[PDB]
Amino acid sequence: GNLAGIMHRPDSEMAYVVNEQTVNIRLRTAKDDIVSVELLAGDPYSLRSLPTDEKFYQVPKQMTKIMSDGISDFWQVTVTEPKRRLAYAFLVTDMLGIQKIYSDKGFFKVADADLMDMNFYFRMPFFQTIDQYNAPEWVTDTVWYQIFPERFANGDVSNDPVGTKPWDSTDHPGREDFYGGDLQGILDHLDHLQELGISGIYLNPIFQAPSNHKYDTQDYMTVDPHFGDAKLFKQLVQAAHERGIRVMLDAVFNHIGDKSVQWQDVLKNEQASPYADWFHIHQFPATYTPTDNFEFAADATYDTFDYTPHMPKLNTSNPEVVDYLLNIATYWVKEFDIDAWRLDVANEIDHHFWRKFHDAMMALKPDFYILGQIWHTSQSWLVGDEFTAVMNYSYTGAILQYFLENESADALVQKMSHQLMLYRDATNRMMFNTVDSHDTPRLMTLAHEDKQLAKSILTFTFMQPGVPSIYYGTEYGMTGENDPDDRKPMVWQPELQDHDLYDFMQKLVQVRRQVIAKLSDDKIIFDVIGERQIRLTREDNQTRIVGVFNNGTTDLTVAQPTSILLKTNQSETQLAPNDFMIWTEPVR
Amino acid sequence: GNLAGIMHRPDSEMAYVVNEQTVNIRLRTAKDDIVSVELLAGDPYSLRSLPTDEKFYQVPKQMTKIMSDGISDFWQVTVTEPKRRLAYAFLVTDMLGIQKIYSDKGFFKVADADLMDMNFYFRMPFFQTIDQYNAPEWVTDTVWYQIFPERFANGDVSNDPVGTKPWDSTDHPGREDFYGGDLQGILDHLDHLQELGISGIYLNPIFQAPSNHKYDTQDYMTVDPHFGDAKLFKQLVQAAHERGIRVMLDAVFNHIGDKSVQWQDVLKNEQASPYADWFHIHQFPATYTPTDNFEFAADATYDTFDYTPHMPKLNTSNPEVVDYLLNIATYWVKEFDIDAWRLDVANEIDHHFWRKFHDAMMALKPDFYILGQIWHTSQSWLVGDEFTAVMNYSYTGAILQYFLENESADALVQKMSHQLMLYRDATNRMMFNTVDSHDTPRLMTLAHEDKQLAKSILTFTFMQPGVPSIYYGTEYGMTGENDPDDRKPMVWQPELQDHDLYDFMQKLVQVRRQVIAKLSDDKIIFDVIGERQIRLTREDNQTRIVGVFNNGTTDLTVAQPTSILLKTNQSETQLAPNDFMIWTEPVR
Ligand SMILES: OC[C@H]1O[C@H](O[C@H]2[C@H](O)[C@@H](O)[C@@H](O)O[C@@H]2CO)[C@H](O)[C@@H](O)[C@@H]1O
Ligand SMILES: OC[C@H]1O[C@H](O[C@H]2[C@H](O)[C@@H](O)[C@@H](O)O[C@@H]2CO)[C@H](O)[C@@H](O)[C@@H]1O
Ligand SMILES: [Ca+2]
Ligand SMILES: [Ca+2]
Question: Looking at the domain A3-131, which fold is it?
Fold first, then answer.
């Protein structure tokens, strides 16, 4: 009877509209403290307005315990109501059999609860589809491929930066190196991406900027000339779309580069610049004391990304900045037909701006995908009026920690369960899962070149609800420590490529696209079956996909599956340490 | 170590911006389970970017336990950060001395926590004043007076409805009666309101509509002709403002009356009406089966307020309806200079609309007050982008229950504490407290004509953080059961007025306006000092206001205060049953 562990927050991920007449409701309780939960629910006005003797509270609805995070249990139910108005309360029974009703007014014995008073209950006052979260269906069928354009392929030596180094995937790049990768190189290798099976390309920034990473934007309205031009970008988008590949660009709106027209005008004109209030300048002249690290100053007189004086923060509260950034966001969509924006440092820009951004994008393309780069929990951006999803760093980070270290399977399952219970169910299917990127060490380096372990991490991640992404070169086993070492030139020489891993990744992508993505409204189940042994199940009403992962130090025997989809051991029943086996079976 | 009872929700009432460099942070724990909480907080980027050996987590900030609701304890701290970016985590110690760190990643031993990783922490990513909640300062100095215009004063017999009854405050009105109250009558009695000390008038609907209550609107752009005309309403607003009285009107936007041009066009033209999609019509023709209750139909083919066929619900998702309602909302503000809108059935209209409404009102009048009529918890409307406040029905309902029944003082204090902890501190000071209205029984009836009890309820309510309101006639002791009996004609005959209660209400209003409202950033303390004995304290750094309420069945003795403000017993030390005493003292 741990009443302090019970919570329902109305109008949240715990109470939300799925369609015009249907809502999903959740309740949190302390782990294993509550044995059953029923929902009392119906139209608030029905209690006293309708002449019938029936009352909605006389027909409870059972809730189901769907997940546990080791601290709390989470219960869920779907409710349909034709009047589109809902009052509800929870009947909770603890392990000793003590039942209470829990409502907007607190905890009561049922005999003492004011069940005829609509105001006793929690409320979903009218079911508003305009306020609901919507997931674009095309994302569910996508496997993404992330390209850092300076390092994917050089298709044109004539646009190379001064000082471009010979293309060599065995180099350890410096922070300021150039290798000459560009948009023609991407166009040249679309066949490779189609053969791998990917159906979306995520590019890091491509707009004019002085650096190799291009997060210090000089002009958002121009493709960087070392990458290409507008005609070539249009050609790339149309060629991608012809092959069934969607395109996501990186919007760097939190900060601008110090070589932009706007910041240079501040440096010339100080507070007489018309752009002074496009920034966060505390003292004029806008200045800083240089250090031996180009990306660090201790005392800049203006807010920046991190402490780098080269990335002054934009004032997105200023209506001129809003209009400028919305016009950029609209231009690339309208003129080039991109399918998605990935929003850099999205958490540091205000919600007012992101609501205007969402409204503008959805007015152009109702199926647009808006992905925020946020490393921490992101509930306030994922209500339905701002982003579609965020990068799911905490979820994939938990997976990596489990496979690479020695924690219990229980610990991993608790972390993943906690993550899913932060968000609406449809949101969880839009979250973007990548195990590495241009800002972390490469998978094969984290795995200490253990390819079996890398395959297990990828497969476990590709079974999760979110949408997977492959960082360029993962499919050939590329290594690298953190930035800049995670930005090696792509390995194009066959003698240096891991052909077995490439073949495996094609098979894994196929399972994702042809089997997992094609279940109908599936659910996920996590079972800990032994010391560091996990069974993952995804199932709808016809079909169940099951994956067993043996990450202990002993052999594990399973029943021989009839229809094996993917496995690492030659045996159909035995999993040695770090093996896995994925199979499909009819639901009986 | 009830970890299931510990919760922090980032970006919520538990973590919000107060000003450009300052945030307030709260933590929930299980009642009396956690002995101390410290906050570890600072700029996320400082941990790894700054060359200093100092780290923000080495200087914790103590949190204070501010409230308890009987189930949970609530802790709070204010943090200032010049970089305007905050990462934070909680150090929680239980009664056995077990300490854990609690962060966005869960619960850890301090030795196991990844304190150098900014992503370990909860985040306030940048302090956005554009997203913050703002309270208009003028509301803090207000005492409101609610007028139901058909029943306050008849200043013009010539505009009376057909069948208007003689003015008689001893009648028991029927649902369809008219007594002829109008705007000239309000204008005629502004002296009474000024002498009482009120500084805001809240009117129920005044726009053209067939009924005596005018919630079934016929034309939102016209003062009802039985009430007045535009010139007379302007004269009333200017006369109120000249006396320092602000004006709030009632916006009935959830539903329209069936005699409106728009609904009549639906009845004439069916789905060929241009207004068909201004409503929620499930089947044409739009119809219902009449019953013996004018306000009830079981089978209307369109959504309505409650089950009344005369109030078809408006489709506020439709952009034409949005534009129509925003133009109404703007017209009364721009042309007549009203100070506030009270939003009828506000919970049943979508958040998308209320955000546009908020933006439009604040662009006209940055200090505008937007008050939602919502009976249940209202967190999602009180973030800072929709309403300023709601009617505080749950808070005043808890006060009434305590004074009128026999529950413990503990129960009342727990309920009030729960309410305050739902919302930001500034929001709590904008919540609108009325003990009765045109939809509930009158105070003097609930109190069974016990005037001492009525005075105690009013005084206790006027000491609370929210803004108080007096329903017309309360100051003379008017009685009435629920609607329509709570809408008696106002008592203007001195022989029928309670002159002692009027004198008391003047004194109570004076304490509110001259003492309580003029504390500087006060705090509230609730102390249960005995069986049904409560001490309320409000204090800033110079001054403390204390009120003791004896609602048991025994006498209570207190120390003689030096400066008594208001009391009911003749003694300066003794409180008999249902007495109270309010005093002021310097803070030592
Ligand atoms: O010069 C600072 C920093 O800028 C870029 O970092 C990006 C990062 O890659 C993004 O994923 C995100 O976190 O925002 C940062 C700022 O835009 C460079 O990629 C990085 O090498 C460099 O240190
Ligand atoms: O005819 C239905 C009903 O309409 C009005 O009720 C208002 C109520 O007074 C408001 O405070 C709020 O709850 O919305 C209702 C619908 O607008 C009348 O005041 C009431 O007499 C009548 O029964
Ligand atoms: Ca090139
Ligand atoms: Ca009249």
Answer: Immunoglobulin-like (2.60.40)
